[PDB]
A paper describes a structure:
Organisms accordingly deploy silencing factors, such as the E3 ubiquitin ligase silencing factor of the integrated stress response (SIFI), to terminate stress response signalling and ensure cellular homeostasis. After restoration of mitochondrial import, the E3 ligase SIFI marks HRI and its activator DELE1 for proteasomal degradation to terminate eIF2α phosphorylation and restart protein synthesis. SIFI forms an antiparallel dimer of heterotrimers that comprises two copies each of the E3 ligase UBR4, the E3 ligase KCMF1 and calmodulin. UBE2A was captured by the C-terminal region of each UBR4 subunit that became ordered in its presence. Together, these proteins assemble into an approximately 1.3 MDa structure that is built around an open twisted-ring scaffold (292 Å × 229 Å) and two arms that extend to the side and span about 356 Å.
Tethered to the scaffold’s interior are the UBR box, the WD40 repeat and two DOC-homologous β-sandwich domains of each UBR4 subunit. Their lower local resolution indicates that these modules are flexibly attached to the scaffold. The WD40 repeats reside symmetrically on either side of the ring, where they are supported by a helix protruding from the scaffold. The DOC1 domains are positioned near each β-propeller and engage the UBR box of UBR4 and the N-terminal region of KCMF1 to form a three-component subcomplex, referred to as the KCMF1 module, that fits well into the local ~16 Å map. Indicative of its inherent flexibility, 3D classification analyses indicated that this subcomplex can adopt distinct positions on SIFI. The DOC2 domains reside next to the KCMF1 module, where they combine a β-sandwich characteristic of DOC domains with two exposed Zn2+-coordinating loops to form a potential protein-binding interface. The N-terminal, RING-like domains of its two KCMF1 subunits are located at the centre of this structure, while two additional ubiquitylation modules reside within the peripheral UBR4 arms. With four catalytic modules and a dynamic architecture, SIFI appears to be optimally configured to process many substrates for efficient stress response silencing.
Residue numbers in the entry:
A (entry chain A): 3901 to 4038, 4044 to 4319, 4324 to 4328
B (entry chain B): 3259 to 3337, 3385 to 3544
C (entry chain B): 3758 to 3857, 3866 to 3971
D (entry chain E): 287 to 332
E (entry chain C): 5 to 148
F (entry chain A): 3473 to 3544
G (entry chain F): 287 to 331
Write the structure that this text describes.
């Protein structure tokens, strides 16, 4: 490394020779940087500069494929190894990922953002344990309401934010114990001590004598959705889905990512069939009626109803155009109706939202019945699902029914056939 | 008053009569030109009908319009003074009758939506002679109408070729003010920027670029909602 | 995904030594056998399989469009017949109402065709000196350099180069800008020629 | 087969059970750190 | 408390109203609170779930849940329990909390801090500098 | 390689051996980079899979002439 | 043939005899300037 072997291998031997020779050169570089801050730092910085200049040219150079390609397979081989310098490698990976996601160009996505997402996915989802009887992926447990790690500071090499400092910040998991001990008093005691110790730290931080933790809050328009709808490649969407599913380990983080996804719900209608992976992720995360009820409480049902109404109105305003046939016509509609049916399949949500969903289901079914030329198999399945949901909602107390009849009157008010 | 489409036999009789008129106009042009200068309704009504016919009848109607509008000196050259005076009188009569809406309509219908390069060339010749034989005001108005259609070009793809031709020629043939020159240039560069961004950010732009680099191919076989323009060709009749 | 994958391998440009497979059912000549396997695999997958599937899909789409048009015409006739005692003098919307020949959006093909039409129109406009100066002031040179120099058919590339040359005619500011762009790109490609041999792809064009 | 070449035979896998547990804990902690890193990346800049 | 709020409350309470084995109702209500817009720490959740054991499956009524939230609500401040805190934080039957019992509380929570960190914490809490903290100074911090 | 990593050796000669190896690597890399038809071989390796380099002056008796295999 | 397209037909070659002589003189002078430029490039520092 002191000789300068890393730079020679990077400049000359990375791209020339047989593919086996190229992979041997990449392994040699990974070995040279193994447990060597100096060497690892140098190689990571080279990769950063190269990818950054190619992103500054992506718009003028469509050959990005061959360039960033070999340098990013090197990152992926370097991060695949497990040395004590994983921190700098992960830093390079995250930086390149963010830069390339800020770019929508497929060439840029499929190369840089895809390998960066794969690196992040192999880091977040470690290989299945060999010892410890293959224990579940879940020594430190995160704060319920706070993110004790920082990204802007960590990328800037700040010693305040680092794996050592972060891991020092959180408490050890230790052993809860109290298997046969109710410890009812001890529970209240620990509640009080935890609450006011967190208060102690929070006040110490607002005075400015301690690092400020981060609040578990998202903007609802982040790179999450950026990788979530990439029509560029399905691999990036699948990697993002895996990353979000693994971010959903903690129930509070489950709530936050569920809010993020139910916000991204509109992008499903926008992107059509490209959102299949996001849809699978979203239905998987809410497979428990617990989170279905949580989202219903937040108001997901009116949101999905409005989205279904808007999609059906777009189809109605679209049948006035040519007979242009679209293969993925109704995927968004079918998926939104499937989500609504999945939520309704829980009794309590049905009870509380029959009177509010009857109107939108009636309007949607009536507007779908008008479709003749644009009627697609998916549209037919959506109309059948809406009919089943309506029949499921007609059933109720005479009061609820008469209320549904009052809705029917308003629906007719909103043509000798449709009424 | 009635929409849908016309009966096939109605089109048959229409085509018999219009072929008779086309035969008269081709062999004897001045006769047709003077008949239509005696009857301007004939000239404007033929175009207006060419709206409500099938693409089968369109070639003959456009041929009649070109024979009246651009005589047959140029028509044969493409394949005395009083004759060209009749041509100018006929184009002036058409411009007196043809409002900008109908002008816009047939200009997009035959130059842009024809789908038959032969009809598109007929419309190209017809509009070129319309503009040439028109005076300054109608020239500026026609140029403005085509520059108004210019933003809608991305919906017609390759078909637009002939259209663009006329546009360019007219844009450099009519003495025009600096303001509208800048406006036309801005429209052209804006369409170019939009198409460039579309191609750059296109989901499978990388795939098409690499395949064009390596493998010889004619059409883009991996395309959602295949364009009714790129995919649909002008199927040729054959013995 | 298969094309996505084969393209990745071809981009690696690995000199995998010729693999003389025992199976010789296919008539592969020495030169064709020596062609990169992934290249041949790409050519078969796209020009063969993707083209066959796309042709089948386009035939089905055209037949579906014809069926939809016939059904719409029948419905129009029925509603017109049922609209007795009510007549609307349609004009000249007959076209808009029944004919309803248009390129779908996000169509790389006809999008590139519109780009070619833009290049032709700009080559026409650039002839007029005032229009040429206006287009240069717009920023046409940089757009053509960044995007249209390397994409499209070779005839389109040469037309773009001619258009830029026209834009920079008798225009010291214009020629200066294009020269600066070329110098920058060439110097960047000379800063990694040994590091990365992608210099031939762009520097040649510049 | 491939055992003629001494250099290729060099690679020796060896990994112990308690060090297995420690390494698996390290993997889990690194995964948690990356999760917090991405979540802090998503945090709104408000 | 405005009706607008008691209303949101009943609303969600209802939406989650479900029965089953163990103490689901307690879990359902903890999810209600988080859904309402207030996320308690795992410890707070466990405490409240225990603080309600009237009937099988932790039977909770809307009035009962109102009583539960009325105690802490937004958990902005609780002098009566900052007092309860000083009672717990200060151990060894003293009148002033010390670094020793402070680190004892930290370990009971599961947090390991170097004595140096414990000294920083106690220097921050102490105001006069007597080396000890009365309710006065505990309050100091918890309120600041 | 084996011997270089099997014999306990002094730091001075370790550095000498490393310098020799990297010097040979640098010399070969410069030779390949500046080789008259390096561009041709790189591009052909990219496009057409080729076993040997058919356009070579003074074909080294070692490369072009390999051990002929004895056969029945 | 290719005369249908007006835009392609646009290119008009036209070049006059005295302006031929002037342009040829300009070419010769430009060639001489480039010769002097390269010779001054070769000059020993
Ligand atoms: Ca004490
Ligand atoms: Ca004190
Ligand atoms: Zn198209």
């Amino acid at each position: 490394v002191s000789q300068g072997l890393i730079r020679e291998l990077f400049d000359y031997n990375l791209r020339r020779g047989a593919a086996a020779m190229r992979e041997e050169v990449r392994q040699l570089m990974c070995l040279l940087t193994r447990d060597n801050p100096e060497a690892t730092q140098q190689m990571n910085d080279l990769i950063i500069g190269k990818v950054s200049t190619a992103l500054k040219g992506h718009w003028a150079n469509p050959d990005l494929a061959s360039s960033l390609q070999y340098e990013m397979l090197l990152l992926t081989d370097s991060i695949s190894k497990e040395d004590s310098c994983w921190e700098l490698r992960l830093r390079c990976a995250l930086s390149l990922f963010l830069m390339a996601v800020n770019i929508k160009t497929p060439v840029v996505v499929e190369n840089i953002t895809l390998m960066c997402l794969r690196i992040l996915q192999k880091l977040i989802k470690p290989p299945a344990p060999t010892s410890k009887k293959n224990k579940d992926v879940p020594t430190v447990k995160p704060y319920c309401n706070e993110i004790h790690a920082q990204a802007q500071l960590w990328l800037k090499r700040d010693p305040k934010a680092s794996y050592d400092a972060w891991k020092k910040c959180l408490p050890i998991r230790g052993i809860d114990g109290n298997g046969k001990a109710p410890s009812k008093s001890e529970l209240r005691h620990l509640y009080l001590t935890e609450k006011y110790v967190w208060r102690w730290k929070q006040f110490l931080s607002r005075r400015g004598k301690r690092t400020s933790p981060l609040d578990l809050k998202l903007g609802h328009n982040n790179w999450l959705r950026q990788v979530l709808f990439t029509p560029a490649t399905q691999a990036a969407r699948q990697a993002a889905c895996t990353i979000v599913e693994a971010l959903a380990t903690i129930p509070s983080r489950k709530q936050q990512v569920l809010d993020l996804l139910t916000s991204y719900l509109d992008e499903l209608s926008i992107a059509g069939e490209c959102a299949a992976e996001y849809l699978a992720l979203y239905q998987k995360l809410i497979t428990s009626a617990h989170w279905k009820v949580y989202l219903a409480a937040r108001g997901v049902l009116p949101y999905v109803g409005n989205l279904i109404t808007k999609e059906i109105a777009r189809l109605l305003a679209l049948e006035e155009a040519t007979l242009s046939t679209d293969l993925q016509q109704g995927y968004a509609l079918k998926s939104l109706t499937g989500l609504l049916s999945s939520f309704v399949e829980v009794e309590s949500i049905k009870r509380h939202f029959k009177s509010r969903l009857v109107g939108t289901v009636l309007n949607g079914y009536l507007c779908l019945r008008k479709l003749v030329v644009q009627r697609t198999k998916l549209i037919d399945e959506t109309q059948d699902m809406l009919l089943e949901m309506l029949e499921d909602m007609t059933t109720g107390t005479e009061s609820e029914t008469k209320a549904f009849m009052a809705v029917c009157i308003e629906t007719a008010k909103r043509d000798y056939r449709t009424p | 008053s009635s929409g849908s489409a016309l009966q096939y036999d109605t089109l048959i009789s229409l085509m018999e009569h219009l072929k008779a008129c086309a035969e008269i106009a081709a062999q004897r042009t001045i006769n047709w030109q003077k008949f239509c200068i005696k009857d301007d309704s004939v000239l404007y009504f033929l175009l207006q009908v060419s709206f409500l016919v099938d693409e089968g009848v369109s070639p003959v109607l456009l041929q009649l319009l070109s024979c009246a509008l651009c005589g047959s000196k140029v028509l044969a050259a493409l394949a005395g003074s009083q004759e060209d005076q009749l041509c100018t009188a006929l184009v002036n009569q058409l411009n007196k009758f043809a409002d900008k809406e109908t002008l816009i309509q047939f200009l997009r219908c035959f130059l842009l939506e024809s789908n038959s390069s032969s009809v598109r060339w007929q419309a190209h010749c017809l509009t070129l002679h319309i503009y040439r034989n028109s005076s300054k005001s109608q020239q500026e108005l026609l140029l403005d109408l085509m520059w108004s259609i210019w933003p809608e070009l991305p919906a017609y793809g390759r078909k637009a070729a002939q259209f663009v031709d006329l546009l360019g020629y007219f844009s450099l043939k009519t003495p025009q003010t600096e303001k509208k020159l800048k406006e036309y240039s801005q429209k052209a560069v804006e369409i170019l920027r939009t198409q460039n961004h579309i191609l750059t950010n296109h989901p499978n732009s990388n795939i098409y670029n690499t395949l064009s680099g390596l493998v010889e191919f004619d059409g883009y076989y991996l395309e959602s909602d295949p364009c009714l323009v790129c995919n649909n060709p002008e199927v040729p009749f054959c013995y | 995904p298969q094309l996505e994958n084969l393209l990745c391998k071809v981009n690696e440009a690995a000199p995998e030594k010729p693999q003389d497979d025992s199976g010789t059912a296919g008539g592969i000549s020495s030169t064709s056998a020596s062609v990169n396997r992934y290249i041949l695999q790409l050519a078969q997958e796209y020009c063969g399989d993707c083209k066959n599937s796309f042709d089948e899909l386009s035939k089905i789409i055209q037949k579906v469009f014809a069926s939809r048009k016939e059904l719409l015409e029948y419905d129009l006739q029925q509603r017109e017949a049922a609209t007795k005692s009510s007549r609307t003098s349609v004009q000249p919307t007959f076209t808009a109402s029944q004919y309803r020949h248009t390129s779908s959006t996000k169509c790389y093909g006809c999008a590139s065709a519109v780009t070619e039409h833009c290049i032709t129109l700009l080559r026409a406009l650039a002839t007029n000196p005032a229009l040429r100066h206006i287009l240069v002031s717009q920023g046409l040179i940089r757009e053509l350099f960044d995007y249209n120099l390397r994409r499209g058919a070779a005839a389109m590339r040469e037309e773009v180069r001619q258009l830029m040359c026209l834009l920079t005619r008798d225009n010291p500011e214009a020629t200066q800008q294009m020269n600066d762009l070329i110098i920058g790109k060439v110097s960047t490609a000379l800063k990694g020629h040994w590091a990365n041999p992608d210099l031939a792809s762009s520097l040649q064009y510049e | 087969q491939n055992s003629q070449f001494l250099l290729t035979r060099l690679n020796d896998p060896k990994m112990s059970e308690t060090e297995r547990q420690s390494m698996e804990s390290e993997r889990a902690d690194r995964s948690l750190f990356v999760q917090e890193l991405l979540l802090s990346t998503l945090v709104r800049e408000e | 408390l405005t009706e607008e709020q008691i209303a949101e409350f009943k609303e969600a309470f209802s939406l989650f109203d479900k029965d089953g084995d163990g103490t689901i109702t307690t879990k359902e209500l903890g999810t209600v609170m988080r859904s309402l817009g207030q996320n308690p720490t795992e410890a707070e959740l466990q405490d409240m779930i225990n603080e309600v054991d009237a009937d099988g499956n932790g039977t909770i009524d809307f009035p009962e849940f109102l009583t539960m939230m009325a105690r802490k609500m937004k958990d902005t401040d609780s002098e009566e329990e900052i007092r309860e805190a000083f009672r717990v934080f200060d151990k060894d039957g003293n009148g002033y909390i010390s670094a020793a019992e402070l680190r004892h509380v930290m370990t009971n929570l599961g947090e390991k801090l170097t004595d140096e960190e414990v000294d920083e914490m106690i220097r921050e809490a102490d105001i006069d500098g007597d080396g000890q903290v009365n309710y006065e100074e505990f309050v100091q911090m918890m309120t600041a």
